[PDB]
Amino acid sequence: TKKHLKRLYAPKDWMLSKLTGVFAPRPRAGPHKLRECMTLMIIIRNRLKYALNAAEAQMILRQGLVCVDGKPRKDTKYPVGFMDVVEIPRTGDRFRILYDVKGRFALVKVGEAEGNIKLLKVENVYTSTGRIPVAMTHDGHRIRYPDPRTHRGDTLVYNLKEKKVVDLIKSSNGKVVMVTGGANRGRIGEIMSIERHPGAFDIARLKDAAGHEFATRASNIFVIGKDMQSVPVTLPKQQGLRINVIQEREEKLIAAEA
Amino acid sequence: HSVDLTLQHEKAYQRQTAVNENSHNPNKKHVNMSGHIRYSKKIGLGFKTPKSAINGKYIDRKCPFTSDVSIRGRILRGVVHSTKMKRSIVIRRDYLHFIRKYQRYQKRHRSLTVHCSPCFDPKPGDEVIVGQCRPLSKTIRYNVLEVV
Amino acid sequence: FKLQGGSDKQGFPMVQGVMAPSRVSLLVKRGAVGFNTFRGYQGERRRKSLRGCILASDIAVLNVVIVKTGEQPIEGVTDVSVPRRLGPKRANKIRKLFNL
Amino acid sequence: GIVRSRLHKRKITGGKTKIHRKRMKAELGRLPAHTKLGARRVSPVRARGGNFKLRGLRLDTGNFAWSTEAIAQRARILDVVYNATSNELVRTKTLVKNCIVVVDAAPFKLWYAKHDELKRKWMLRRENHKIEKAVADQLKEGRLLARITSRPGQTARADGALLEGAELQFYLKKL
RNA sequence: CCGGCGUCUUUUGACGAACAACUGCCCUAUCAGCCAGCGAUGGCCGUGUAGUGGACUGCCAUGGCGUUGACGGGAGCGGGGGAUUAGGGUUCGAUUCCGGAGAGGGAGCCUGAGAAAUAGCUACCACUUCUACGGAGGGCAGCAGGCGCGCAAAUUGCCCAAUGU
RNA sequence: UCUGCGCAUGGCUCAUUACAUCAGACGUAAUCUGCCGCAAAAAUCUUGCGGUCUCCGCAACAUUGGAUAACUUGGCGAAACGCCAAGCUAAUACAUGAACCAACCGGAUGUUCUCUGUUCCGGCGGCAGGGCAACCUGCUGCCAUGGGACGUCCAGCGAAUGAAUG
């Protein structure tokens, strides 16, 4: 059982430094995996800057002033992965974490009624006792009584105001879809095709807007909406389009002349 | 029903543990083996089931066709080195390793053991396909899906 | 009197279950009378030396309990009553004690 | 202690493994439980899963089942006739999975006679039913041959199924 | 009338634990045959384990590996990486990160979800400390520090403010 | 001081070690998993009072029981992260135990009566005659592809076995 983590062996999507400190926090197990998560203390301290020190993050959280999933937390360490709404009511602000283009955690700011919306990808379906069907998700949530049309790897729109599931969205056909992991993170596009290799990983080919096709694993597909004009949730800072190295450098210079 | 003593030589008997075939019925009479109760299992990666498994008699608990033994990640190919042993064959893979300094390849072979289903009995020099199953002996991890 | 416990001239306790007129070394669990309850981790035994059940001339001290009481009073014991340290902290016990 | 490992064993090349590691508690044999006949005695052991498993000693009763009719009743284990593994086992009347055995047979008899509202149910069940001959002869006498299809050495319960024609005819001839 | 904690059992994601395998790895033939009484290779039935398995019992079969270097011996914790090189290469890796193993030498064990733990236990052996000698203890390859050793290596300091648990 | 949780992680050291260990890729449909997250939960005849046989009748925020440390008292031993007796008294420690509240789902059925099959190929029960006691003949009553009404027993989760489904 591991209870310690070193800064280098920790993700640098948390944007820790080589120098200053030796350890990084190992979060308590929860909805999300160690690599894909970002621990509370990291967010509050290094990004939002409502804390300058570890101890100050305990001060805020133990007390309680912070909610995720609309539930208040007294937890110092807790995962925050993907499609999680966090709300600090003291500020009155609602963040929705996502994957920004270029592999960065996005923190995107939402209207208040969008922060009751959430999207969870389904992993398995199975029948449990009493013939009661269950969809188990990638956040470990159990949706009792899902629709009879549910399949593995589809999204379920999930009301956090009161817990239930309205209409689903499938991974079928061309639909607006975004990537999770694999270093095509936050890049958005239509499904062009879904290749099958049975007994092995199923490739899928995505085509983003303004062309430039590419390939990513089925496992890394996470649906957004029916269409780009039917999206239920906001996009991060960049729209889900990447640009060439040359153009990055060019634009960096142009703005620096101001 | 009645015994088939062609199969049996054991002090334990042998039965198929998946499905009861020991029920007495006249529905196993006036038929070679087709009307007799069997268990059959598809392998869904494109390995078509033989006739033999489906209609057969043979009782084996270490082949995927008449047992709950399953086919998983790895699938490899290789020839027949020897047919020796009972329900166990010996496969020889051969491939090429590369050495950077001399910019030249070398031949290196893995001599491996496998559990050959009593359905198949390939001759020396034939090529075999073999899947990834749970351990079955000390050395044996594989099973014979198909034969060329 | 009923005999109860007592010790060797090396402080080592007598044990009712052990039978010896001598001292032997034995495995002694935490809950036994050779090793204290509160020492060490959960689920343990040690090796302590101690004395059996049978008495001899190696006894420094012997502890008893009065069962039947003679016609000759002995000071500090049958001439003296000492009250309870604490009364009951359970509800229902107060109802049995004052019979209310 | 006792271990289950390939690291005290010869390789396929006839060579010998060399060690660098002291044995784990993950790998861990324990001594075999001996289930016989006589008064039931059950000694638990704690296992790695955080739960207990029960060592059957001396089970003289089992929960037995009759094939084809989808039933079962308890009855008393009397004798062991046969076993695949050894003759030695049979003589001590040890009970381990796939021993042929002998049972009281009484409840099965009782049941099969029940197999005015009642009366016509019987006549319907008598119809489209038959039984093997070698079965019924034994079942008349009040003894039967069965197999113990649960492992009693790690559950401390002995359950068995009753032999039917195809398989019965084999074990019979081995005696 | 409502709120916040706490707990039993069941259920499955996560954090991990435990197995298995595809491919790769220094020198040596003045090391060429190696393996099966007591398991070597496999089949059959059981036993055991959290679980698969010659892991183990019984029965049966006679196999398994080798000049594409088995087997034995010598040197060595493994990798990421360091040094040097126009290129190809050459050489190093005890050591910050990751993985494995160990706590004087060995073995056995309890508890626990997880240990064959060693600033936990039991025994033996090599050492070693107290005792009015009836007995009782000790394990720095944790930080300082001492002795020994060798060409060779720091203070018996201050602090939980920071970074983590 | 009892109780709960952690102390198996970090730290330090390279002795063993070449189909070992490790690195990249891969499987565990062959398994375990505290803390954490999202969740699930309808078995349970109990409590109190009155009479009274260990039996009934009522009533229903359920009104449960018994010890052990610190402590006190006597102490022991050269010393010991060595220990003893007696008296105390706690619980989210330990041991008991929840009717009513209570939905829904079936099977086994009963010597309960109500419709019923306007007939005879069959069965069962009773009586009479003959009998080799195996059996036959005659007569009477009931049932035969049916559903209601009423009574009784088993029914939950987890685990074992057989059978059906998947």
JSON list of C-alpha atoms (C1' of nucleotides) in Angstrom, two decimals, chain E residues 29-143:
[
{"chain": "E", "resi": 29, "resn": "A", "atom": "C1'", "xyz": [34.27, -25.07, -24.39]},
{"chain": "E", "resi": 30, "resn": "U", "atom": "C1'", "xyz": [41.70, -26.15, -21.10]},
{"chain": "E", "resi": 31, "resn": "C", "atom": "C1'", "xyz": [32.80, -26.23, -18.82]},
{"chain": "E", "resi": 32, "resn": "A", "atom": "C1'", "xyz": [29.35, -30.71, -23.83]},
{"chain": "E", "resi": 33, "resn": "G", "atom": "C1'", "xyz": [26.15, -33.37, -22.64]},
{"chain": "E", "resi": 34, "resn": "C", "atom": "C1'", "xyz": [22.01, -31.98, -18.95]},
{"chain": "E", "resi": 35, "resn": "C", "atom": "C1'", "xyz": [17.14, -33.94, -16.32]},
{"chain": "E", "resi": 36, "resn": "A", "atom": "C1'", "xyz": [13.69, -38.75, -13.40]},
{"chain": "E", "resi": 37, "resn": "G", "atom": "C1'", "xyz": [15.49, -43.58, -6.40]},
{"chain": "E", "resi": 38, "resn": "C", "atom": "C1'", "xyz": [13.01, -38.60, -3.27]},
{"chain": "E", "resi": 39, "resn": "G", "atom": "C1'", "xyz": [9.20, -35.07, -10.18]},
{"chain": "E", "resi": 40, "resn": "A", "atom": "C1'", "xyz": [12.46, -34.81, -14.62]},
{"chain": "E", "resi": 41, "resn": "U", "atom": "C1'", "xyz": [8.24, -33.81, -19.43]},
{"chain": "E", "resi": 42, "resn": "G", "atom": "C1'", "xyz": [3.13, -34.94, -20.11]},
{"chain": "E", "resi": 43, "resn": "G", "atom": "C1'", "xyz": [-1.99, -37.30, -19.36]},
{"chain": "E", "resi": 44, "resn": "C", "atom": "C1'", "xyz": [-5.94, -38.88, -15.65]},
{"chain": "E", "resi": 45, "resn": "C", "atom": "C1'", "xyz": [-8.56, -38.24, -10.67]},
{"chain": "E", "resi": 46, "resn": "G", "atom": "C1'", "xyz": [-8.17, -35.71, -6.38]},
{"chain": "E", "resi": 47, "resn": "U", "atom": "C1'", "xyz": [-5.66, -32.46, -2.44]},
{"chain": "E", "resi": 48, "resn": "G", "atom": "C1'", "xyz": [-4.20, -27.46, -1.25]},
{"chain": "E", "resi": 49, "resn": "U", "atom": "C1'", "xyz": [-4.24, -22.14, -2.01]},
{"chain": "E", "resi": 50, "resn": "A", "atom": "C1'", "xyz": [-7.55, -15.93, -2.29]},
{"chain": "E", "resi": 51, "resn": "G", "atom": "C1'", "xyz": [-6.53, -18.35, -7.23]},
{"chain": "E", "resi": 52, "resn": "U", "atom": "C1'", "xyz": [-4.42, -20.93, -11.99]},
{"chain": "E", "resi": 53, "resn": "G", "atom": "C1'", "xyz": [-0.56, -24.84, -11.91]},
{"chain": "E", "resi": 54, "resn": "G", "atom": "C1'", "xyz": [3.66, -31.41, -10.72]},
{"chain": "E", "resi": 55, "resn": "A", "atom": "C1'", "xyz": [2.23, -26.39, -6.26]},
{"chain": "E", "resi": 56, "resn": "C", "atom": "C1'", "xyz": [1.42, -31.45, -3.96]},
{"chain": "E", "resi": 57, "resn": "U", "atom": "C1'", "xyz": [-0.46, -36.92, -3.15]},
{"chain": "E", "resi": 58, "resn": "G", "atom": "C1'", "xyz": [-1.92, -41.44, -5.86]},
{"chain": "E", "resi": 59, "resn": "C", "atom": "C1'", "xyz": [-2.30, -43.91, -10.78]},
{"chain": "E", "resi": 60, "resn": "C", "atom": "C1'", "xyz": [-0.60, -44.09, -15.94]},
{"chain": "E", "resi": 61, "resn": "A", "atom": "C1'", "xyz": [2.53, -42.63, -20.05]},
{"chain": "E", "resi": 62, "resn": "U", "atom": "C1'", "xyz": [8.32, -41.75, -21.70]},
{"chain": "E", "resi": 63, "resn": "G", "atom": "C1'", "xyz": [9.25, -37.64, -22.39]},
{"chain": "E", "resi": 64, "resn": "G", "atom": "C1'", "xyz": [11.72, -32.50, -21.97]},
{"chain": "E", "resi": 65, "resn": "C", "atom": "C1'", "xyz": [16.36, -29.26, -23.34]},
{"chain": "E", "resi": 66, "resn": "G", "atom": "C1'", "xyz": [21.25, -28.74, -26.35]},
{"chain": "E", "resi": 67, "resn": "U", "atom": "C1'", "xyz": [26.59, -25.85, -30.99]},
{"chain": "E", "resi": 68, "resn": "U", "atom": "C1'", "xyz": [20.92, -20.75, -32.98]},
{"chain": "E", "resi": 69, "resn": "G", "atom": "C1'", "xyz": [25.86, -22.94, -26.65]},
{"chain": "E", "resi": 70, "resn": "A", "atom": "C1'", "xyz": [22.15, -26.27, -22.84]},
{"chain": "E", "resi": 71, "resn": "C", "atom": "C1'", "xyz": [24.58, -27.40, -18.11]},
{"chain": "E", "resi": 72, "resn": "G", "atom": "C1'", "xyz": [28.62, -25.62, -14.83]},
{"chain": "E", "resi": 73, "resn": "G", "atom": "C1'", "xyz": [32.05, -21.73, -13.30]},
{"chain": "E", "resi": 74, "resn": "G", "atom": "C1'", "xyz": [33.80, -16.35, -12.93]},
{"chain": "E", "resi": 75, "resn": "A", "atom": "C1'", "xyz": [32.38, -11.01, -12.61]},
{"chain": "E", "resi": 76, "resn": "G", "atom": "C1'", "xyz": [27.68, -7.99, -11.48]},
{"chain": "E", "resi": 77, "resn": "C", "atom": "C1'", "xyz": [21.33, -5.60, -8.11]},
{"chain": "E", "resi": 78, "resn": "G", "atom": "C1'", "xyz": [18.14, -4.22, -12.90]},
{"chain": "E", "resi": 79, "resn": "G", "atom": "C1'", "xyz": [16.46, 0.06, -15.80]},
{"chain": "E", "resi": 80, "resn": "G", "atom": "C1'", "xyz": [15.89, 5.37, -16.73]},
{"chain": "E", "resi": 81, "resn": "G", "atom": "C1'", "xyz": [20.62, 7.62, -17.26]},
{"chain": "E", "resi": 82, "resn": "G", "atom": "C1'", "xyz": [26.54, 9.36, -16.69]},
{"chain": "E", "resi": 83, "resn": "A", "atom": "C1'", "xyz": [31.51, 9.97, -19.41]},
{"chain": "E", "resi": 84, "resn": "U", "atom": "C1'", "xyz": [33.78, 10.12, -24.26]},
{"chain": "E", "resi": 85, "resn": "U", "atom": "C1'", "xyz": [33.06, 9.98, -29.73]},
{"chain": "E", "resi": 86, "resn": "A", "atom": "C1'", "xyz": [32.44, 13.86, -36.75]},
{"chain": "E", "resi": 87, "resn": "G", "atom": "C1'", "xyz": [29.85, 9.16, -37.73]},
{"chain": "E", "resi": 88, "resn": "G", "atom": "C1'", "xyz": [29.78, 4.06, -36.35]},
{"chain": "E", "resi": 89, "resn": "G", "atom": "C1'", "xyz": [30.86, 3.12, -31.63]},
{"chain": "E", "resi": 90, "resn": "U", "atom": "C1'", "xyz": [33.67, 2.60, -26.64]},
{"chain": "E", "resi": 91, "resn": "U", "atom": "C1'", "xyz": [33.03, 2.46, -21.51]},
{"chain": "E", "resi": 92, "resn": "C", "atom": "C1'", "xyz": [30.45, 3.33, -16.70]},
{"chain": "E", "resi": 93, "resn": "G", "atom": "C1'", "xyz": [25.61, 2.59, -13.58]},
{"chain": "E", "resi": 94, "resn": "A", "atom": "C1'", "xyz": [27.21, 1.62, -5.37]},
{"chain": "E", "resi": 95, "resn": "U", "atom": "C1'", "xyz": [24.36, 6.41, -5.47]},
{"chain": "E", "resi": 96, "resn": "U", "atom": "C1'", "xyz": [18.61, 11.23, -5.46]},
{"chain": "E", "resi": 97, "resn": "C", "atom": "C1'", "xyz": [13.58, 8.59, -9.75]},
{"chain": "E", "resi": 98, "resn": "C", "atom": "C1'", "xyz": [11.23, 3.83, -10.81]},
{"chain": "E", "resi": 99, "resn": "G", "atom": "C1'", "xyz": [11.30, -1.72, -9.90]},
{"chain": "E", "resi": 100, "resn": "G", "atom": "C1'", "xyz": [13.35, -5.91, -6.75]},
{"chain": "E", "resi": 101, "resn": "A", "atom": "C1'", "xyz": [15.69, -7.73, -2.37]},
{"chain": "E", "resi": 102, "resn": "G", "atom": "C1'", "xyz": [17.65, -7.28, 2.82]},
{"chain": "E", "resi": 103, "resn": "A", "atom": "C1'", "xyz": [17.84, -5.51, 8.30]},
{"chain": "E", "resi": 104, "resn": "G", "atom": "C1'", "xyz": [24.13, -10.11, 12.58]},
{"chain": "E", "resi": 105, "resn": "G", "atom": "C1'", "xyz": [23.60, -15.25, 10.19]},
{"chain": "E", "resi": 106, "resn": "G", "atom": "C1'", "xyz": [19.04, -18.92, 9.32]},
{"chain": "E", "resi": 107, "resn": "A", "atom": "C1'", "xyz": [14.28, -20.92, 10.14]},
{"chain": "E", "resi": 108, "resn": "G", "atom": "C1'", "xyz": [9.39, -20.84, 12.18]},
{"chain": "E", "resi": 109, "resn": "C", "atom": "C1'", "xyz": [4.91, -17.87, 13.78]},
{"chain": "E", "resi": 110, "resn": "C", "atom": "C1'", "xyz": [0.97, -14.43, 15.36]},
{"chain": "E", "resi": 111, "resn": "U", "atom": "C1'", "xyz": [-2.04, -10.20, 14.23]},
{"chain": "E", "resi": 112, "resn": "G", "atom": "C1'", "xyz": [-3.97, -7.57, 10.08]},
{"chain": "E", "resi": 113, "resn": "A", "atom": "C1'", "xyz": [-7.42, -5.97, 4.06]},
{"chain": "E", "resi": 114, "resn": "G", "atom": "C1'", "xyz": [-2.21, -6.30, 3.13]},
{"chain": "E", "resi": 115, "resn": "A", "atom": "C1'", "xyz": [3.93, -8.91, 6.63]},
{"chain": "E", "resi": 116, "resn": "A", "atom": "C1'", "xyz": [6.74, -14.55, 6.60]},
{"chain": "E", "resi": 117, "resn": "A", "atom": "C1'", "xyz": [7.49, -7.45, 9.54]},
{"chain": "E", "resi": 118, "resn": "U", "atom": "C1'", "xyz": [12.57, -7.47, 12.68]},
{"chain": "E", "resi": 119, "resn": "A", "atom": "C1'", "xyz": [13.01, 0.24, 16.68]},
{"chain": "E", "resi": 120, "resn": "G", "atom": "C1'", "xyz": [6.87, -7.37, 16.40]},
{"chain": "E", "resi": 121, "resn": "C", "atom": "C1'", "xyz": [7.28, -12.41, 18.43]},
{"chain": "E", "resi": 122, "resn": "U", "atom": "C1'", "xyz": [9.68, -17.77, 19.03]},
{"chain": "E", "resi": 123, "resn": "A", "atom": "C1'", "xyz": [14.13, -21.00, 18.58]},
{"chain": "E", "resi": 124, "resn": "C", "atom": "C1'", "xyz": [19.20, -22.14, 17.29]},
{"chain": "E", "resi": 125, "resn": "C", "atom": "C1'", "xyz": [24.18, -20.37, 15.98]},
{"chain": "E", "resi": 126, "resn": "A", "atom": "C1'", "xyz": [28.15, -16.44, 15.90]},
{"chain": "E", "resi": 127, "resn": "C", "atom": "C1'", "xyz": [28.70, -12.14, 19.04]},
{"chain": "E", "resi": 128, "resn": "U", "atom": "C1'", "xyz": [27.20, -8.89, 23.10]},
{"chain": "E", "resi": 129, "resn": "U", "atom": "C1'", "xyz": [25.14, -6.04, 27.95]},
{"chain": "E", "resi": 130, "resn": "C", "atom": "C1'", "xyz": [23.41, -5.86, 33.07]},
{"chain": "E", "resi": 131, "resn": "U", "atom": "C1'", "xyz": [22.88, -9.02, 38.08]},
{"chain": "E", "resi": 132, "resn": "A", "atom": "C1'", "xyz": [23.87, -8.57, 46.13]},
{"chain": "E", "resi": 133, "resn": "C", "atom": "C1'", "xyz": [24.81, -14.63, 40.15]},
{"chain": "E", "resi": 134, "resn": "G", "atom": "C1'", "xyz": [17.88, -16.53, 42.01]},
{"chain": "E", "resi": 135, "resn": "G", "atom": "C1'", "xyz": [17.62, -14.17, 37.03]},
{"chain": "E", "resi": 136, "resn": "A", "atom": "C1'", "xyz": [17.04, -10.30, 33.15]},
{"chain": "E", "resi": 137, "resn": "G", "atom": "C1'", "xyz": [18.37, -8.41, 28.37]},
{"chain": "E", "resi": 138, "resn": "G", "atom": "C1'", "xyz": [20.78, -6.31, 23.37]},
{"chain": "E", "resi": 139, "resn": "G", "atom": "C1'", "xyz": [20.60, -6.15, 16.82]},
{"chain": "E", "resi": 140, "resn": "C", "atom": "C1'", "xyz": [22.56, 1.68, 13.73]},
{"chain": "E", "resi": 141, "resn": "A", "atom": "C1'", "xyz": [22.69, -1.33, 6.24]},
{"chain": "E", "resi": 142, "resn": "G", "atom": "C1'", "xyz": [17.29, 4.96, 10.59]},
{"chain": "E", "resi": 143, "resn": "C", "atom": "C1'", "xyz": [20.04, 10.54, 12.15]}
]
